[PDB]
Amino acid sequence: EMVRGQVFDVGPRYTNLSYIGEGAYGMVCSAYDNVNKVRVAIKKISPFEHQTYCQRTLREIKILLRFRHENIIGINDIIRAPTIEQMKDVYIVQDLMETDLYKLLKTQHLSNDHICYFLYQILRGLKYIHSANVLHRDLKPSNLLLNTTCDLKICDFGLARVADPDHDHTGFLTEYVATRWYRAPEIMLNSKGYTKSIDIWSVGCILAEMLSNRPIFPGKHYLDQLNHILGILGSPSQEDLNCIINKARNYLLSLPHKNKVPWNRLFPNADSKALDLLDKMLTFNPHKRIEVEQALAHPYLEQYYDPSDEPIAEAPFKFELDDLPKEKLKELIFEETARFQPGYRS
Ligand SMILES: O=c1cc(-c2ccnc(NC3CCOCC3)n2)ccn1[C@H](CO)c1ccc(Cl)c(F)c1
Numbered sequence: 001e002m003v004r005g006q007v008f009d010v011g012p013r014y015t016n017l018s019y020i021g022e023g024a025y026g027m028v029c030s031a032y033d034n035v036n037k038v039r040v041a042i043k044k045i046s047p048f049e050h051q052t053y054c055q056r057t058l059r060e061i062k063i064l065l066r067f068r069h070e071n072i073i074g075i076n077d078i079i080r081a082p083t084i085e086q087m088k089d090v091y092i093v094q095d096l097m098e099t100d101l102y103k104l105l106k107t108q109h110l111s112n113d114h115i116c117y118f119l120y121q122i123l124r125g126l127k128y129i130h131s132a133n134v135l136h137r138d139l140k141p142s143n144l145l146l147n148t149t150c151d152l153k154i155c156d157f158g159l160a161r162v163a164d165p166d167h168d169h170t171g172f173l174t175e176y177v178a179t180r181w182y183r184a185p186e187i188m189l190n191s192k193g194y195t196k197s198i199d200i201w202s203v204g205c206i207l208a209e210m211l212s213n214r215p216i217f218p219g220k221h222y223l224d225q226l227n228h229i230l231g232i233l234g235s236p237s238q239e240d241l242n243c244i245i246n247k248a249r250n251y252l253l254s255l256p257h258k259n260k261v262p263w264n265r266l267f268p269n270a271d272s273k274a275l276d277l278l279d280k281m282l283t284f285n286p287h288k289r290i291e292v293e294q295a296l297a298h299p300y301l302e303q304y305y306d307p308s309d310e311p312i313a314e315a316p317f318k319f320e321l322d323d324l325p326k327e328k329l330k331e332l333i334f335e336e337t338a339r340f341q342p343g344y345r346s
Contacts, residue, residue: 003029010042010079010091017042025053030096040076043092047333052176054329055321056158057090061336062319063134063157069311071125073097073145073155078340087334097153101141101206105213112271114149115210119274120304121152122203123296129154130196130292132313133163137193139202140182141209162317164194169245175322178202180225181215186286188222190245197286200295204281211267211274216282223251233284234260240285273300 002008003017006027010017014031021028026045033040047053064075079091101118104110110118122144129136136143137159145153159176169191177183177193184201186192208216216232219225230236235258241249263275277298280290290298296305321329338344 039096041094041096044089046089048330051326054326058329058333059160060157063160069128071121073153078337080337084334097145098147101144110210120301125154127292127310133316135161135163136199137177140179167194185284189248197289200281200289207278211270230258232261234258
């Protein structure tokens, strides 16, 4: 029943459990599915003591239950108690993946070819996300699940949002956007975490990481993060500085003049086509940044690009939840996971 410490209680359908990983409010195991006669992954999530944790759980369930794409992880089943009072944990059943891009980059240097097809799969998945008017907001190697060189799946839609390009600059300390190393400069400079451009920047960082087996911008904190970006891209132009909305223009104007390090000096063994696409993805100005359809049509991905085999969402996605108390989110999580319960009507 239990996996060395915490109880699982996923049976009688899910047996022969083995521990995978853990976090602040969750634990992941592999389990044998006695129905589909295959091994699956089960995410035990206990978020109900904290509002933000509830937001992330609900966010990922609503989005993954609506999405159906080869490069996006799905939700196969959800195990949860029959009453709200009894519900303390939520078990999310997903397809079992061998590993993730983070683990792979620790043991292997990827060939140009593999990188290429990994990049294509990420962008193929992203095209579906963006066509649904959705932003992942946390794209990074550990959120890129793998089985083979031909089987990649984007996971963890906890930070996902519907794209609202014309919305309030919220506040710097109000929301957690990307993982720092993959965080777009617009998020750090003028709190803009509701445009498609932020995801293309993350992908750019992932591409640079596949090319050298190390993160391109490993900042200690967000100012160090901007210093790292500036160290390669160079000191921003007057036009690029006009996009900075905040005090924010100050510390950048305080820094010495940094020249643009050429991509080929940073990555001498990389294909010039990959470095040309990397350049378009890692543009400091979000308005000048390459869009997902343009990245796919780039010459670097010409051997895989096929718009007739790249599915898009049937309709844009719609849900706000961030201002709701943890008790209402628990109620919404109960409603969303009701499909997987016995006796479910309508
Ligand atoms: O949502 C998911 C789904 C999976 C998942 C799904 C299917 N298969 C495999 N296989 C793994 C085999 C070993 O290598 C990594 C992939 N993983 C893995 C992680 N996550 C997120 C990432 O933020 C996560 C991480 C820790 C905790 Cl605690 C958690 F709740 C959620």
